[PDB]
Design a protein around this ligand. Structure first.
Ligand code: BR
Ligand code: BR
Ligand code: CA
Length: 1040
């Protein structure tokens, strides 16, 4: 029954934590203390993951380097203690937090890429010729083919150039030293509009520019190319366009094609005007809009536009190459190419026709990626397309946890196998790739292998059709090999399989892998706009919904710079909007193991939060009460199936992933509303490229999308993104709706306009065209775009929930009835109407903070909907469920637990404004004791609240020794009804703040007690003491 799930939730409803072991510094005494704290807070389990080793942190004197006998003894003891306490465990598939590496992997067994070497020679008879050796990682390299291409032009690929620059920006304060300049090594820097000029001795013909960088630089890809024969009259060649790109973009340079241009002078003009704001698919646009280029390489030999990404070496999306850029005469036919593979530190002997020929020697080598955050378990990443390599990774780490510990205990407690978010670049080859390509795509890749160096063949269109097939195959192999093999291994060891995202680092369909896993998992960050991953969150939730996975996990509260002012009151709105998106099992990031019992707050992940661990000031009472709210919420939010009326198709480009709401605004302007259309015009215009600092010390693009401003963006409908695999393999028409196994059922199917991640757009395959037609004939609404009405009520599809803005919500339904989660996102008390798409059933209001149920709230039935009036306090949330006078106190005694000080006061006070330093700089818990008089006996159906006024930051209330609650969020009041008596009552309130004030104290030689230490170095920029204590005033509230 719903009422007993809410009141006595199951173990599946409890949140979990990540548990990080730092630098091999681990102790048994800390393990016991940590696991007991976790059990007392009400967590269900933890994922044990060690991060770095003694080399990275020698000062900590760690005795538990990964994979040593001493380390395995800590893992065994942890398992033993988890069993005693009734907690469960998981571990990741490698040391560190990403991804699938270890010291047992050789270069041959690691991720592979196609590499090559060039040389030009005269034809006729060739004899014992040595060829240049391609890139070989640690000396590993293997030949595949050797091609001979008849040169298109005899002139050289590059020529010498005199390089100069010129500032063109005028007026006002222009820091003259930040105008364009070139250093000793040729590196070009600028913060103001400028040109860079290349002068050739004789006219040069340029077909593309290879842009080479030091790190990332969005602005480098926005140059405007101009050319001149006479040194004064210049003509426009091309405005360059940045390719879509993710945070791991540095493994390859970028080639921008132009129309073939013969000139003595090339000018590259730059301005920051017209820049796009940062996002997950233009990651470098997050950073300051300054220009920085290591080298521009102007090439003569023809190449496809942005080929590095199109060959799958790196995660990128760009437009197909225009005919103006690569025409018939720029491509090679198959009959022109002479394959010299058969003719054998090797040499070549054979004979060519007369003329000059390019000797293109192709092969493969390792990409060079490692599980970089590992300690003892660090080495090369496994080949993701090789099933024996993938199995080997499993056997050498995760499988060993059932052998090198106690095997019977391991089998009871270690029930979860995790793979985290991908951080190992991309790969475009393996020994099996040709054959896999052959079965799946229906033709041979091998004669076309020079496409993977960007050398065009037959036509531009034909070259790019095949390169898309290479990319498609890459993504298919991530799922059918790496995930498939790991899923077999997990089932063999009786483990559940959780996984986070593959996008935006590895070429993939970002949703596709979620079919092979039990527990899709997303990520959401606290106070970290440059590192948040809302598109990851939508990949995991969309994947779960379309592939029928009921439990959706999330790595929550990850904080790029923690500053020790975080407590549960300021985490609630963040959590609730991610519940509205559709997660239902939270994993806290992060609980770090503190091996010392006399250092507080102790060891952290170099100051990366959330600092969620036993030595937090608010752990004992605050972590517990938060986790109780979380468990009540998650009991209802795992019930039944989620409701979503709209499916949005993710297309046929590669790579691909779920679609962010902002990118749908041009398709559905009516649904989003005019105010959203207008605010988006202004944001994307991005006038002045404004900067924001958040957190302390992280300067970034101010107009980047903020997920807090995208609550209920379709104004009462919900959507999932939806891929070709689900369309072709799972979708079925039933009663005018598109259904999928596991409970998804959509009335609308959107085929969005061309968009930044699908700009061509990629043509729909005949099979996709066929299924869409079928679904349309069966009653599924395929709207005509742009869709301009406010909603879909014209077609019989009303909004699910009608509420005002800044109200986050979700809807679940099953045999026992319907549930709406409704949450206030503002720091304001608000009263509003909520209108739900439910006809003639009685609603109830269930309160997740307190566990109270009000089964008889007022409501009105109107036009076959149900309306209620809700009052929500700041950040307050509620579930709507449908079945099928001043205090007058004596002298306060206030006792500061951590340092034993006690004082006597008549009036309440802010700790941070006291003259005594041991109070002024205090962080921790203080116990207030007083008495008050109650006039009359408590009547029947009379309810009394003690209102606490302003609490900094949480308070537990006790009346005549009876616990009346831990108060951590609005409204700040406790129900004292049952504890009251006539006469004098005893009043005790325990109040706890955050660590900020004590750390500022300790930093300045004014620590308020002994034993303060942390490796977390970041602090609030403001340099102020925060408000602290029970500020009041205290008041009674009597009602019925
Ligand atoms: Br870049
Ligand atoms: Br897009
Ligand atoms: Ca992650």
């Amino acid at each position: 029954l719903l009422r007993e799930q809410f009141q006595n939730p199951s173990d599946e409803a409890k949140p979990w934590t990540f548990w990080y072991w730092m630098f091999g510094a681990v102790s048994k005494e800390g393990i016991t203390a940590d696991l007991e704290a976790m059990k007392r807070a009400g967590l269900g389990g933890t994922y044990l993951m060690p991060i770095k080793g003694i080399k990275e942190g020698p000062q900590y004197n760690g005795k538990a380097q990964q994979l040593t006998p001493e380390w395995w003894e800590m893992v065994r003891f942890s398992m033993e203690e988890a069993d005693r306490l009734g907690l469960k465990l998981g571990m990741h598939i490698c040391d560190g937090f990403a991804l699938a590496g270890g010291p047992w992997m050789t270069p041959k067994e690691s991720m592979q890429k196609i590499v090559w070497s060039d040389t030009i020679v005269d034809g006729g008879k060739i004899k014992g010729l040595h060829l240049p050796q391609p890139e070989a990682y640690e000396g590993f390299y293997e030949d595949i083919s050797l091609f001979a291409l008849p040169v298109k032009e005899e002139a050289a690929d590059v020529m010498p150039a005199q390089i100069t620059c010129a500032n063109i920006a005028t007026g006002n304060h222009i820091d003259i030293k930040k105008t364009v300049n070139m250093d000793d090594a040729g590196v070009i820097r600028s913060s103001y509009p400028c040109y860079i000029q290349y002068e050739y001795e004789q006219p040069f013909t340029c077909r593309n520019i290879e842009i080479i960088l030091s790190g990332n630089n969005y602005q480098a890809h926005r140059l405007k190319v101009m050319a001149s024969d006479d040194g004064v009259n210049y003509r426009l060649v091309k405005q360059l366009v940045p390719a879509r790109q993710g945070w791991q973009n540095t493994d390859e340079n970028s080639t921008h094609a132009i129309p073939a241009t013969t000139a003595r002078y090339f000018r590259f003009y730059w301005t920051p005007e017209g820049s796009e704001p940062g996002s997950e698919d233009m990651d470098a646009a997050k950073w300051k809009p300054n220009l920085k280029i290591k080298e521009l390489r102007l090439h003569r030999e023809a190449r496809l536009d942005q080929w590095e990404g199109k060959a799958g070496l790196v995660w990128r999306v760009a437009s197909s190459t225009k005919k103006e850029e690569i025409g018939e005469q720029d491509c090679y036919a198959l009959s022109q190419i002479i394959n010299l593979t058969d003719p054998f530190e090797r040499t070549l002997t054979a004979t060519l026709p007369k003329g000059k020929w390019k000797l293109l020697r192709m092969g493969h080598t390792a990409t060079g990626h490692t599980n970089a955050t590992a300690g003892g378990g660090k080495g090369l990443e496994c080949d993701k397309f090789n099933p024996k390599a993938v199995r080997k990774q499993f056997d050498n780490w995760f499988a060993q946890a059932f052998v090198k510990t106690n095997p019977d205990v391991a089998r009871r407690v270690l029930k979860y196998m995790h793979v985290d978010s991908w951080q190992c670049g991309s790969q475009n080859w393996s020994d099996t790739f040709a054959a896999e390509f052959r079965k799946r795509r229906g033709y041979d890749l091998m004669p076309y292998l020079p496409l993977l160096a960007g050398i065009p063949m037959e036509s531009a269109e034909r070259s790019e059709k095949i390169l898309r097939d290479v990319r498609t195959t890459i993504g298919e192999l991530v799922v059918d090999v790496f995930y498939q093999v790991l899923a077999d291994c997990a089932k063999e060891y009786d483990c559940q399989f959780s996984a986070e995202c593959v996008a935006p680092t590895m070429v993939s369909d970002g949703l596709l892998h979620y079919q092979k896993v039990d527990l899709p998992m997303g990520e959401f960050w606290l106070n970290s706009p440059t590192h948040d991953k809302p598109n990851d969150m939508l990949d995991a939730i969309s994947g779960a919904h379309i592939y029928g996975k009921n439990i959706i996990q999330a790595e929550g509260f990850t904080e790029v710079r923690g500053t020790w002012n975080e407590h549960p009151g300021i985490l609630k709105a963040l959590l609730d909007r991610n519940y509205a998106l559709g997660i239902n099992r939270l994993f806290f990031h992060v609980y770090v193991h503190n091996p010392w019992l006399d250092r507080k707050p102790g060891m952290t992940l170099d100051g990366i939060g959330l600092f969620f661990q036993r030595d937090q000031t608010w752990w004992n009472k605050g972590a517990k009460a938060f986790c109780e709210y979380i468990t009540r919420c998650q009991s209802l939010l795992q019930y039944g199936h989620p409701v979503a009326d709209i499916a949005v198709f993710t297309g046929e480009e590669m790579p691909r992933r779920s679609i962010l709401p902002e990118r749908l605004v041009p398709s559905l302007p009516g649904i989003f509303g005019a105010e959203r259309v207008e605010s988006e015009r202004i944001r994307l215009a991005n006038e002045g490229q404004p900067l924001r600092v958040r957190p302390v010390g992280v300067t970034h693009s101010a107009n980047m999308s903020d997920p807090e401003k995208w609550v209920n963006p379709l104004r009462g409908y919900a959507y999932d993104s939806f891929n070709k695999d689900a369309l072709l393999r799972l979708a079925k028409a039933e009663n005018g709706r598109m259904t999928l196994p596991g409970g998804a059922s959509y009335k609308v199917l959107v085929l969005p306009l061309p968009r930044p991640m699908n700009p061509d757009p990629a043509a729909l395959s005949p099979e996709v065209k066929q299924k869409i037609n079928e679904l349309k004939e069966a009653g599924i609404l395929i709207p005509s775009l742009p869709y301009k009405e406010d909603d879909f009520s014209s077609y019989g599809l009303e909004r699910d929930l009608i509420v005002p803005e800044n109200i986050a919500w979700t809807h679940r339904q099953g045999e026992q009835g319907d549930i709406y989660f409704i949450a206030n996102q503002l720091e304001e008390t608000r009263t509003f109407t909520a209108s739900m798409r439910i006809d003639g059933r009685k609603p109830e209001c269930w309160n997740p903070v307190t566990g109270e149920i009000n089964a008889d709230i007022p409501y009105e039935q109107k036009s076959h909907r149900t309306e209620i009036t809700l009052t929500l306090a700041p950040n307050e949330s509620v579930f709507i469920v449908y079945p099928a006078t001043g205090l007058e106190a004596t002298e306060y005694t206030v006792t500061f637990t951590a340092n034993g000080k006690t004082i006597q006061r008549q009036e309440l006070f802010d700790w941070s404004k006291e003259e005594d330093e041991q109070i002024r700089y205090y962080s921790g818990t203080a116990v207030y004791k007083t008495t008050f008089r109650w006039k009359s006996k408590v009547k029947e159906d009379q309810q009394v609240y003690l209102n606490l006024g302003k609490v900094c930051d949480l308070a537990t209330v006790r009346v005549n020794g009876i616990d009346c609650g831990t108060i951590w969020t609005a409204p700040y009041r406790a129900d004292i009804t049952a504890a009251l008596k006539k006469g004098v009552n005893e009043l005790e309130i325990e109040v706890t703040n955050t660590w900020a004030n004590a750390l500022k104290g300790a930093d300045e030689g004014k620590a308020p007690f002994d034993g303060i230490w942390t490796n977390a170095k970041y602090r609030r920029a403001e340099n102020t003491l925060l408000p602290a204590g029970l500020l009041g005033p205290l008041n009674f509230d009597v009602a019925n």
